[PDB]
mmCIF file with all atom_site columns, C-alpha atoms and ligand atoms in Angstrom:
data_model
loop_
_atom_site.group_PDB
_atom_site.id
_atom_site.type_symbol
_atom_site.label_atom_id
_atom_site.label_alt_id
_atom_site.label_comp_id
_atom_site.label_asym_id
_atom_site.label_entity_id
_atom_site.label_seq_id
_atom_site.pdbx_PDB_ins_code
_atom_site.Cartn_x
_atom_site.Cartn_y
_atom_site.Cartn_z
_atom_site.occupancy
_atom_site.B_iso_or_equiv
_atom_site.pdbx_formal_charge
_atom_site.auth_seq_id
_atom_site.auth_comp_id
_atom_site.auth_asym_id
_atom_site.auth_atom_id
_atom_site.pdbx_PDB_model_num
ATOM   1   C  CA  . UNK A 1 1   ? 0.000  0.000   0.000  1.00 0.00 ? 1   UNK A CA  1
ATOM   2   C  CA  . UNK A 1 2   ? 1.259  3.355   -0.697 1.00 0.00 ? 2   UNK A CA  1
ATOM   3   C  CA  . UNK A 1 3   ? -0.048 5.650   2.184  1.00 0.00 ? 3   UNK A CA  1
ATOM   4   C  CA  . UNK A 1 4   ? -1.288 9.166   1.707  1.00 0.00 ? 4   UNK A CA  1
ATOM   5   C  CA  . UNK A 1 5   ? 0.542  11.756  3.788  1.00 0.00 ? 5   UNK A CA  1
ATOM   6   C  CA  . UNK A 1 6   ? -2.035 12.337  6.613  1.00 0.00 ? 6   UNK A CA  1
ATOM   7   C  CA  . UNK A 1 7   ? -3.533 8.942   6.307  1.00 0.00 ? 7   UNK A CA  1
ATOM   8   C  CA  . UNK A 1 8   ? 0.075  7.572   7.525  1.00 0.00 ? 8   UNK A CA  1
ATOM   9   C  CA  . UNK A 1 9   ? 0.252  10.594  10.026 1.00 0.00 ? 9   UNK A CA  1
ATOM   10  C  CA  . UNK A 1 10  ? -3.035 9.218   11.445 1.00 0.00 ? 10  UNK A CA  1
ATOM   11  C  CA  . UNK A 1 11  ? -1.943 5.564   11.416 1.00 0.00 ? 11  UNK A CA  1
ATOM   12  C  CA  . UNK A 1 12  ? 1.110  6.750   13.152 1.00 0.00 ? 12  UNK A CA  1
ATOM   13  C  CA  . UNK A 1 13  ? -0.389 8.495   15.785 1.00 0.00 ? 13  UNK A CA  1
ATOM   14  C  CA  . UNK A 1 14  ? -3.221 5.813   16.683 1.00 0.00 ? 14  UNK A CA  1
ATOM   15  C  CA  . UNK A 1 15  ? -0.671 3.025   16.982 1.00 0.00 ? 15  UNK A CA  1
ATOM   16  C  CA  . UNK A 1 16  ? 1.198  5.588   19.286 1.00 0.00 ? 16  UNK A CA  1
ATOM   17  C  CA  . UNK A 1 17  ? 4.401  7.029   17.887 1.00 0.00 ? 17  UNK A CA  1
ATOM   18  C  CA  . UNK A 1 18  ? 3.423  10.951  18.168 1.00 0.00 ? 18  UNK A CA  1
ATOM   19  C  CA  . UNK A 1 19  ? 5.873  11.775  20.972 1.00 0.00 ? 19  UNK A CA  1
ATOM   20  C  CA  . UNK A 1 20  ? 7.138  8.637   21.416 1.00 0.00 ? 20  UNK A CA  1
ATOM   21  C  CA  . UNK A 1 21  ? 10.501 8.878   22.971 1.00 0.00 ? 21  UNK A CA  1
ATOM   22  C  CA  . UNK A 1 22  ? 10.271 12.619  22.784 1.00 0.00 ? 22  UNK A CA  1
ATOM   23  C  CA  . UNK A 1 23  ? 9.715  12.472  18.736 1.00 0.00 ? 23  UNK A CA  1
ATOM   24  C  CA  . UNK A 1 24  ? 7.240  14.589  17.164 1.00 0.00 ? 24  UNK A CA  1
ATOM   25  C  CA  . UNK A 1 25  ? 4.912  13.172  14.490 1.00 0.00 ? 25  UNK A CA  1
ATOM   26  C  CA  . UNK A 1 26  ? 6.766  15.155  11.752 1.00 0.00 ? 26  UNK A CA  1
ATOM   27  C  CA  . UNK A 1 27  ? 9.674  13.448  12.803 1.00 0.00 ? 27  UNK A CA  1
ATOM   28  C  CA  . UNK A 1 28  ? 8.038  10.270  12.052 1.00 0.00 ? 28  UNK A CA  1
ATOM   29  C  CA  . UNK A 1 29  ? 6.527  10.861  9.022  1.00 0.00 ? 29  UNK A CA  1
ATOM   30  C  CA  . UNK A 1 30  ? 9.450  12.406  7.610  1.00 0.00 ? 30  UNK A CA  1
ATOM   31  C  CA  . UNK A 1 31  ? 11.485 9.448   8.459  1.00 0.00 ? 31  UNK A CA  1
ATOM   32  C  CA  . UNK A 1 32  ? 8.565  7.510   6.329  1.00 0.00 ? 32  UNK A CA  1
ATOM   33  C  CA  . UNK A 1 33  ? 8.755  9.737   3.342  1.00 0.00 ? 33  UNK A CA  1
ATOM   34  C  CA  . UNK A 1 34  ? 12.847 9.715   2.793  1.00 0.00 ? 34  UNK A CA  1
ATOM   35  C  CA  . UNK A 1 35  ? 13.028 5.650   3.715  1.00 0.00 ? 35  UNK A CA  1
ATOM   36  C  CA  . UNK A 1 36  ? 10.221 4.145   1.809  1.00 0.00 ? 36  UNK A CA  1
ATOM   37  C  CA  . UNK A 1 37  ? 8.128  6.923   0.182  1.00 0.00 ? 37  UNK A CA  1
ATOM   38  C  CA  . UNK A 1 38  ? 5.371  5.825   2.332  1.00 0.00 ? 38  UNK A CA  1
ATOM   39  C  CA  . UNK A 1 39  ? 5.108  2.374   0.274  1.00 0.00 ? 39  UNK A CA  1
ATOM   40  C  CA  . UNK A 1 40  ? 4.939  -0.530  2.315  1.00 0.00 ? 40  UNK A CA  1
ATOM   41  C  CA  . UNK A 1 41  ? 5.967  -2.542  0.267  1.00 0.00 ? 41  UNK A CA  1
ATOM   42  C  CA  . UNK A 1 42  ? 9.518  -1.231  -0.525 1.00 0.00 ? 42  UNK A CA  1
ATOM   43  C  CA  . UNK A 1 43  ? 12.868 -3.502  -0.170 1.00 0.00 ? 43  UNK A CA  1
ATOM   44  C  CA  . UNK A 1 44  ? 16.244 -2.370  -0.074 1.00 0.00 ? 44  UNK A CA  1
ATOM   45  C  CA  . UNK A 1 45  ? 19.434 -4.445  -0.196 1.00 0.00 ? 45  UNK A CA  1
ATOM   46  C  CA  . UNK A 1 46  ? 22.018 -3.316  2.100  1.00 0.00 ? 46  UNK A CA  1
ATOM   47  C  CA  . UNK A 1 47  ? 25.938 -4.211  1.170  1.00 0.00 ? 47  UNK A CA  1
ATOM   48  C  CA  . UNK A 1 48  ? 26.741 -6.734  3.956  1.00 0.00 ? 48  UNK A CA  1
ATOM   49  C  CA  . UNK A 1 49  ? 23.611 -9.042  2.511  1.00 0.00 ? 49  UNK A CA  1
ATOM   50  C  CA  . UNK A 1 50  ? 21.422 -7.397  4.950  1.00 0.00 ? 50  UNK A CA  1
ATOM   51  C  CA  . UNK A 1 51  ? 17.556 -6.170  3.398  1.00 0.00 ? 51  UNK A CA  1
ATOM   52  C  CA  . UNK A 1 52  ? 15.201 -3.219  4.554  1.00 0.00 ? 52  UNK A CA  1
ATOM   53  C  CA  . UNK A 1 53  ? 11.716 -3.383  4.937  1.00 0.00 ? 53  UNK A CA  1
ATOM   54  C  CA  . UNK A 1 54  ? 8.520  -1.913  4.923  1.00 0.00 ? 54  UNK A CA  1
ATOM   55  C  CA  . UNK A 1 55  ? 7.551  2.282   5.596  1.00 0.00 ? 55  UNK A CA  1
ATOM   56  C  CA  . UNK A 1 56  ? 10.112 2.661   7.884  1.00 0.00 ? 56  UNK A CA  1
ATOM   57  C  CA  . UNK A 1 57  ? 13.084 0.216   6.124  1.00 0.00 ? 57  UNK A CA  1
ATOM   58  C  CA  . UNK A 1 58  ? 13.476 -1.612  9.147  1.00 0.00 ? 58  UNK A CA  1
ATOM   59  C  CA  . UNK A 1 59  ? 16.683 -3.969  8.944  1.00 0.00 ? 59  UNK A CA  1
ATOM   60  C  CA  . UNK A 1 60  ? 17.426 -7.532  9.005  1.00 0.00 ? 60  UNK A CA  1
ATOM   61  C  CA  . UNK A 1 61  ? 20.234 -7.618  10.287 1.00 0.00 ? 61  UNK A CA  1
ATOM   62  C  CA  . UNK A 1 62  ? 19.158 -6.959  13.970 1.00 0.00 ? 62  UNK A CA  1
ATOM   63  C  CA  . UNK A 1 63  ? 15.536 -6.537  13.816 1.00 0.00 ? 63  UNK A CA  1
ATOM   64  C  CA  . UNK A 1 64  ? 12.946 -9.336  11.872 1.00 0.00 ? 64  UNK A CA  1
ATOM   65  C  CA  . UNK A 1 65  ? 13.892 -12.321 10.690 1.00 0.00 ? 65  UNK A CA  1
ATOM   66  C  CA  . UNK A 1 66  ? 14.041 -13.264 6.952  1.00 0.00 ? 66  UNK A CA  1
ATOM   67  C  CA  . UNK A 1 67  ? 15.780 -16.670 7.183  1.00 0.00 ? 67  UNK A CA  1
ATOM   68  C  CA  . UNK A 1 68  ? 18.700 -15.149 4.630  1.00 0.00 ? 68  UNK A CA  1
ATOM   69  C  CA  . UNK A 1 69  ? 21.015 -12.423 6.646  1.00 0.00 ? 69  UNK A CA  1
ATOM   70  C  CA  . UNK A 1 70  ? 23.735 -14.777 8.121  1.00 0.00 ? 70  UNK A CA  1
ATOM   71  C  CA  . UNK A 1 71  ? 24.661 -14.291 11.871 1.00 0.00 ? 71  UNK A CA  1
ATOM   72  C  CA  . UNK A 1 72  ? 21.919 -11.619 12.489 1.00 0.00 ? 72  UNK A CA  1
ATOM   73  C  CA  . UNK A 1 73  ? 19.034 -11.154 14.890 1.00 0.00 ? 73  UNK A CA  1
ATOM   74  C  CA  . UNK A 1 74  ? 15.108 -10.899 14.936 1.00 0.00 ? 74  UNK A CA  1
ATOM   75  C  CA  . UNK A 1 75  ? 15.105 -8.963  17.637 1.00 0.00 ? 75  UNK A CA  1
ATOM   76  C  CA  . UNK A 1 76  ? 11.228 -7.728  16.989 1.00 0.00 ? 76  UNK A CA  1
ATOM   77  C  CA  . UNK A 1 77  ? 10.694 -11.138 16.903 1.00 0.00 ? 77  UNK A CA  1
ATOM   78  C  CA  . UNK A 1 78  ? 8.694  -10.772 13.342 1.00 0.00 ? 78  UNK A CA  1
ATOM   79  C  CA  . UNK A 1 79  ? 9.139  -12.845 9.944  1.00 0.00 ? 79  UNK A CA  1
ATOM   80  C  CA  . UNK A 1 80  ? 10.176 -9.556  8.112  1.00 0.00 ? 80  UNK A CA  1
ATOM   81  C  CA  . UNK A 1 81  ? 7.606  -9.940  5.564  1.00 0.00 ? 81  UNK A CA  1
ATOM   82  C  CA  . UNK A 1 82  ? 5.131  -8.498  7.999  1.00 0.00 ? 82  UNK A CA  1
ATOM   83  C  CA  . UNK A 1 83  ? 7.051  -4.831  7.825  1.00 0.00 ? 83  UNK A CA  1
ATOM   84  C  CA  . UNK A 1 84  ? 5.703  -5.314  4.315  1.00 0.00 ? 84  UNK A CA  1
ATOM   85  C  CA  . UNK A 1 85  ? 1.879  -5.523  4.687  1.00 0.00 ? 85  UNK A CA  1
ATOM   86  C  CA  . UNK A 1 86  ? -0.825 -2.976  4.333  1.00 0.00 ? 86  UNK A CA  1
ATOM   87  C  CA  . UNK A 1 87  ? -1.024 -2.991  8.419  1.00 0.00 ? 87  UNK A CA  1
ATOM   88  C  CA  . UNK A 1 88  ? 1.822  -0.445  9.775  1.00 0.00 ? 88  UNK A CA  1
ATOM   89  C  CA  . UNK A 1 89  ? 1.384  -2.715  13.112 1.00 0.00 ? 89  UNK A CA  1
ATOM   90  C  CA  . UNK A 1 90  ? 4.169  -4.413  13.230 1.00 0.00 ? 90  UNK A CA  1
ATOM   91  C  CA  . UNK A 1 91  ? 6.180  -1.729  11.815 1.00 0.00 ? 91  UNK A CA  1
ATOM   92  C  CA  . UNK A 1 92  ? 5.208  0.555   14.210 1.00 0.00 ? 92  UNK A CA  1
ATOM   93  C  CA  . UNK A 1 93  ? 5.688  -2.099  17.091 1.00 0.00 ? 93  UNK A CA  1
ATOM   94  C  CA  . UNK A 1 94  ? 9.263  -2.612  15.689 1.00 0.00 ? 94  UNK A CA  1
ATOM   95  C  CA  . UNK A 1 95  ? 10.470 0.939   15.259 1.00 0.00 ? 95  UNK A CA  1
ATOM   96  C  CA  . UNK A 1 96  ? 9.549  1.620   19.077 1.00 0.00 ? 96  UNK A CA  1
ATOM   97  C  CA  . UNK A 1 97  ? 12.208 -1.333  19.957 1.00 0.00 ? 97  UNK A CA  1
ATOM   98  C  CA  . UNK A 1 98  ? 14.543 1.165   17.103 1.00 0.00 ? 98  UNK A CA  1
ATOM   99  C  CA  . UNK A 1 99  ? 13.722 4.129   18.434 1.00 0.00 ? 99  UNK A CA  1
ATOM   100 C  CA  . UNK A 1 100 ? 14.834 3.187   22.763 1.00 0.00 ? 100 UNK A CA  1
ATOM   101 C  CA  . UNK A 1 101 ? 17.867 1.297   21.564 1.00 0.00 ? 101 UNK A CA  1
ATOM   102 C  CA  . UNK A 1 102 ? 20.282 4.232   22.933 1.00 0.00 ? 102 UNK A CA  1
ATOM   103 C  CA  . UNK A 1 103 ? 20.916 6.264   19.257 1.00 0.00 ? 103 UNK A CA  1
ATOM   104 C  CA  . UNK A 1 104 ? 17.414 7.525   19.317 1.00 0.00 ? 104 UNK A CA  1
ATOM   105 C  CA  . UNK A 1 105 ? 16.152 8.393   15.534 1.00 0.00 ? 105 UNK A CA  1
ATOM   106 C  CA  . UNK A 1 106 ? 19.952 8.062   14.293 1.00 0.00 ? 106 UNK A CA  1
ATOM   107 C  CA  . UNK A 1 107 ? 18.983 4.808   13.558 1.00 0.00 ? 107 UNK A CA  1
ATOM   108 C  CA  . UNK A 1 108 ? 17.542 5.627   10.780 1.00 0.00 ? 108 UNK A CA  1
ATOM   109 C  CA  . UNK A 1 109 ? 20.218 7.284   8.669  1.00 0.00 ? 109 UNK A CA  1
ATOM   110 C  CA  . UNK A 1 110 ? 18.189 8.528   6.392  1.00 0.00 ? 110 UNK A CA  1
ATOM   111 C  CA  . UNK A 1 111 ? 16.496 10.150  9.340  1.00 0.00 ? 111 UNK A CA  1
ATOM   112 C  CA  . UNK A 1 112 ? 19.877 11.664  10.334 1.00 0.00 ? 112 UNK A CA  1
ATOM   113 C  CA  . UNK A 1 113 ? 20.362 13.214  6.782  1.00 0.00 ? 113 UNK A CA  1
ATOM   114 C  CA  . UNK A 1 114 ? 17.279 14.393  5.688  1.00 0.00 ? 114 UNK A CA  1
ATOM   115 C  CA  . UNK A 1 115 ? 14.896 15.187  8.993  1.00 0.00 ? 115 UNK A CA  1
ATOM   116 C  CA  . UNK A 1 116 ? 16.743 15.572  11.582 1.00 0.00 ? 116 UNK A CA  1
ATOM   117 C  CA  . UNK A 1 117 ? 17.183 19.581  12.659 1.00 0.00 ? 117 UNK A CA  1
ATOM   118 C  CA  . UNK A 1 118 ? 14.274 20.470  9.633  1.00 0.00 ? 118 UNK A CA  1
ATOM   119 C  CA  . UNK A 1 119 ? 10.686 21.810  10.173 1.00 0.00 ? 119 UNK A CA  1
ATOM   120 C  CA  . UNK A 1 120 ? 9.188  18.270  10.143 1.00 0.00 ? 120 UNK A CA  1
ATOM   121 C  CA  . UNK A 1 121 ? 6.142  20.054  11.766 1.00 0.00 ? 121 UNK A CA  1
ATOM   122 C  CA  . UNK A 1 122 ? 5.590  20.736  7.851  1.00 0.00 ? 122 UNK A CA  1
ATOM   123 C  CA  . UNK A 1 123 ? 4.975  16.696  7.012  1.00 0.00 ? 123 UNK A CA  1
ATOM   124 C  CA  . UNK A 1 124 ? 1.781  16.635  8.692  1.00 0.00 ? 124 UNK A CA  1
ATOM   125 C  CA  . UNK A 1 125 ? 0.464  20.174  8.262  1.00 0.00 ? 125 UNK A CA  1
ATOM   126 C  CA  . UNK A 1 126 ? -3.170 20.079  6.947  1.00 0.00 ? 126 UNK A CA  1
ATOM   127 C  CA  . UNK A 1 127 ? -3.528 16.608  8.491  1.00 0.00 ? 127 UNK A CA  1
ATOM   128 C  CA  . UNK A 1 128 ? -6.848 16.205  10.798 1.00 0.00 ? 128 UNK A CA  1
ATOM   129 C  CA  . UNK A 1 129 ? -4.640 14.908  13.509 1.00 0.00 ? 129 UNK A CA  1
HETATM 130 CL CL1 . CL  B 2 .   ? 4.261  13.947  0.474  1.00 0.00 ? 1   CL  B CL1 1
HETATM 131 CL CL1 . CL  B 2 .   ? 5.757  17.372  14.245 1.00 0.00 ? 2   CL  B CL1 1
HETATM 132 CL CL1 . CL  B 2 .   ? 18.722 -15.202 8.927  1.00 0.00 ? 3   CL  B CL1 1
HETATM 133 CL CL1 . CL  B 2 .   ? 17.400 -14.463 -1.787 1.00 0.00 ? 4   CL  B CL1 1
HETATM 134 CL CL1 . CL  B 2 .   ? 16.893 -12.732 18.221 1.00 0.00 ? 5   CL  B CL1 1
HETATM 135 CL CL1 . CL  B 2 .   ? 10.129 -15.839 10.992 1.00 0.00 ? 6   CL  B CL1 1
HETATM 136 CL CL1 . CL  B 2 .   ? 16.675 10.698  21.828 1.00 0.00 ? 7   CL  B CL1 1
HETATM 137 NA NA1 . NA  B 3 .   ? 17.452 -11.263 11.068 1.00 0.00 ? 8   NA  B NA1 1
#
């Protein structure tokens, strides 16, 4: 599914991530735009045979398992197929592990380059939040 702007900004904030350790919304949706362009369907193969998944490009190599990533965790304890469906629930569930692991939002590097430090207020202005 490819989510509209404020429909993911919704989703976001029903499942609980407005605020959630300390990030704004924007923050979250931002991160959403740069690392998937709000599809969740999107893949990326990483260099060290690692893959990203879903709206938020979560990684194999510590976080879901996808039975081909060679000495790495599933540390969300999800087949990482389900970052991938139409339901942001396990994504959302998985990025709030992410998010309290100690680097905050720089876990997303993406995040880091393109969000971080930028009105990200402005990603879910008009929304009906
Ligand atoms: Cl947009
Ligand atoms: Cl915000
Ligand atoms: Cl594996
Ligand atoms: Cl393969
Ligand atoms: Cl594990
Ligand atoms: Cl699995
Ligand atoms: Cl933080
Ligand atoms: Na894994």
């Amino acid at each position: 599914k490819v989510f509209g702007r404020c429909e993911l900004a919704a989703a976001m904030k029903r499942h609980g991530l407005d605020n959630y350790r300390g990030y704004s919304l924007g923050n979250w949706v931002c991160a959403a735009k740069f690392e998937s362009n709000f599809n969740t369907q999107a893949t990326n193969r990483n260099t060290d045979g690692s893959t990203d998944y879903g709206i938020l490009q979560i990684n194999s190599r510590w976080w879901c398992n996808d039975g081909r990533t060679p000495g790495s965790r599933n540390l969300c304890n999800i087949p990482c197929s389900a970052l991938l469906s139409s339901d942001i629930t396990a994504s959302v569930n998985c990025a709030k592990k992410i998010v309290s692991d100690g680097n905050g939002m720089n876990a997303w590097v993406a995040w880091r380059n393109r969000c971080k430090g930028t009105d990200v207020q402005a990603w879910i202005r008009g929304c009906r939040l």
